């Protein structure tokens, strides 16, 4: 086509929707990680995760307000990349990336995955 | 704005 | 922070919410443009658009399934607005330019009211 | 990624 891009209109959308999460606005699902709670909007979460795309695109699991995942994930490793969702940056440290690459596989972020992986990699 |  | 980044993640996240967009999943409201109408999520509306903003943080419209906009808006140019919204590109044509840019003053959608200035101030 |  003939079109124009604004360049910055992906990451001014993003922040828009991670301010929306920050003052709790329309958001319509509650992610239960043992006794943590994540507040989120279903949309990010399936345009993020392979797993919430396919918990959210079930029949079923598209109407429920509350998804409980599995007990071995670790809170923090969640909450990281759920901030990594709304934001793109992801805060990857030494004493969180095994929980971090984890939690990752579990909720199929591939690119997530791979940096783990190649930083784990480079400590050995 | 650019030619994508 | 020592946060690291993903580059492409912003844009990543715009196609999936399109790719949503097209099968038409967890679209939330109908936007009635004359006798068309536009299926869309909220959150991306409001997130792009100054108007939207403002609809859906409304306590009673918030709940609303169908917003009917303004008589005087022309369907072709809130489609390419829409478009625009969930993929940073804008079908500006010599033929459009002035529809687009009425829609996108209405919208409050301030980066592409500056390009429709800008192509115009050219022309003249 | 990148050092942002
Ligand atoms: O690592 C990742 C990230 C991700 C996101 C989605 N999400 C969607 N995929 C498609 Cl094709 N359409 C709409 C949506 Br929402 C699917 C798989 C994966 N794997
Ligand atoms: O030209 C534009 C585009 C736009 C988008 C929003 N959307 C939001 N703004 C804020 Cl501050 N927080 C959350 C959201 Br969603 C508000 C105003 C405008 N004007
Ligand atoms: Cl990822
Ligand atoms: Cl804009």
């Known amino acids: ?18 301010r929306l999460r920050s003052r709790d606005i329309l958001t319509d699902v509650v ?3 043992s006794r943590e709670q994540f ?14 795309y396919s918990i959210f695109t079930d029949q079923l699991k598209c109407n429920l307000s509350v998804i409980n995942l599995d007990p071995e994930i670790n809170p923090e ?3 990281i990349l759920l901030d990594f969702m709304y934001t793109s940056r992801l805060n990857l440290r030494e004493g969180n990336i095994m929980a971090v690459m984890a939690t ?6 591939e690119h997530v995955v791979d940096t783990c992986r190649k930083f784990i990699k480079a400590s050995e | 704005w650019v030619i994508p």
């Open chain 1, 1 to 18: 086509d003939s079109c124009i891009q604004f360049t910055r209109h992906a990451s001014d959308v993003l922040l828009n929707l991670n």
């Open chain 1, 31 to 33: 992610i239960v990680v």
């Open chain 1, 39 to 52: 507040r989120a909007h279903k949309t990010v979460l399936m345009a993020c995760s392979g797993l919430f």
């Open chain 1, 77 to 79: 490793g969640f909450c």
């Open chain 1, 104 to 109: 990752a596989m579990y909720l199929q972020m």
